[model samples]
Target: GSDSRTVSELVTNTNTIRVAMKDAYQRDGKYPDYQAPLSLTADSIKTDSTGIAVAQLVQLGKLTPDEARNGISGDYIGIGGAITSSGSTINKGFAMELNGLSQEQCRSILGQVGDNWEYVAVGTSPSGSYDALSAGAVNMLAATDNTTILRSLAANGQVSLTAEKILKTCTATVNSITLASR
Candidate 1:
């Protein structure tokens, strides 16, 4: 006789099998972190797969999306730059804007997103040009690891803390250009 699989059985079995596999892989022969129980239900209408169900849990705030984008860490560094002028003198500067987020916020966001990211600031202008600019730099590698937290700080308005350190100076007497990071 051929074996038959039911929808309920399939869902439950797949979930169990997947969970066991993941647990085993992540196990370093140490204690496991607390995990909520997962349930599988048969739907009268069409339903998504187990993986989709888990993703939905994350979206619903039950599970965290930390591991979802872990590999994207170090993918790109934050950067901001601009140019401005005071009278005829021009200046240029650059900074890594954490979107107005504090160090704590930056760390939280990167941690939540599991991104291994870093940031740096630099400033430059045409040599011998009558330009003066303030520059600030931050070593984000020792800062935060969570992108969500960084985003939160930026969204809620916390940039002043990071912006306070930047300063600029300039002197000139001609139609000149300037640049800076804001």
Candidate 2:
């Protein structure tokens, strides 16, 4: 990085940013000290498996094809992002786990599927593999059955997939990006 300002001017700008951030939580700042309240569940669905969880999210409305493209937290479910609802088992869908499919692998898959996978990304304990999908999203990744997809991926040791019921929604078409574990 390079700077063209006199050292003193740079110092002045530094203080400006520092002070603004310190008061960023102030009433008039971009952020509020007290955030507004939001809710999930009821209008949501959950499962222990990603395949089934996505199906429920699609069915329950916590997630949409649009939201899935961007990364649905609870949209149709609660409006979608990192699901924050908790303290129980029933208030969820297959909590996202990781899928080892690589970015290159994802791209390959994307091309294979038709327009059904208009957009495809990934998520995880939302980490390495998750971002891989996001950074690599090329507009695809669909299957008539994610269960079978998972089984196939696991068979080749290219990914780790769990056993679960996949709604034609997830395993089928109109799929979203992905969700997480991290």
Candidate 3:
């Protein structure tokens, strides 16, 4: 379902989550811990630092459940870490994730949303459940050195992306678009 409504909802929801997370990080000092299948309690927020989930956002009143849903899909968007590098330290800085998608859906979403972000990654093995795209060539949160090639994919960073590049990136049948923070 690569319809405009679906793609538009996904992009809008991602932006809402992204903005809230960034604002919350300024207040909390770090991003929440990675929560997939996206569930968390109010108490969990105290200990969870590195990733943030829709549940936490809902419980905290930052977003309603409807805002977190994928509209047509009726599933909450996925969540994962945005590992950042700082000299000798590597810690979770932001969050980035996308629901499992078909090639058409992948290009549709990324083509619109990928323009403003500096980091992007594609996960091929999205068939498994719970953090399925957490690793592989799409490991944006290795918590290691800056050797990950994902950072390289965004040559323009937040400037813009060409149609050719979007087509090139979504070359797989089933891919997960990694939506990292800027």
The number of the candidate with the highest TM-score is: 3
TM-scores, all models, native as reference: 0.16, 0.19, 0.71
Error of 2 at 160 (Å): 29
Give per-residue CA lDDT, model 3, range 119-144, as digits (tens). 66565535333354344123343332
- lDDT agreement of model 3 with the native: 0.56
Clashing pairs in 3: 31-50, 32-50, 32-51, 33-51
* Model 3 spans with C-alpha error above 4 angstroms: 1-5, 38-52, 71-74, 86-92, 125-133, 136-159
- Give candidates' CA RMSD values in order: 22.8, 18.8, 5.6
In the range 105-133, model 2's lDDT, one tens digit per residue, is 23233333312221223323121223323
Candidate structures ordered by TM-score, highest first: 3, 2, 1
**lDDT of candidate 1 over 91-166, digit per residue (tens):** 1222222222223332233222221112222222322221222132221222222221121112332222132222
Instruction: For model 1, give the RMSD to the true fold.
Output: 22.8
Q: In lDDT terms, how accurate is model 2?
A: 0.26
What is model 3's C-alpha RMSD? 5.6
> What is the lDDT for 174 in model 2?
23
Clash counts for all predictions: 26, 25, 4
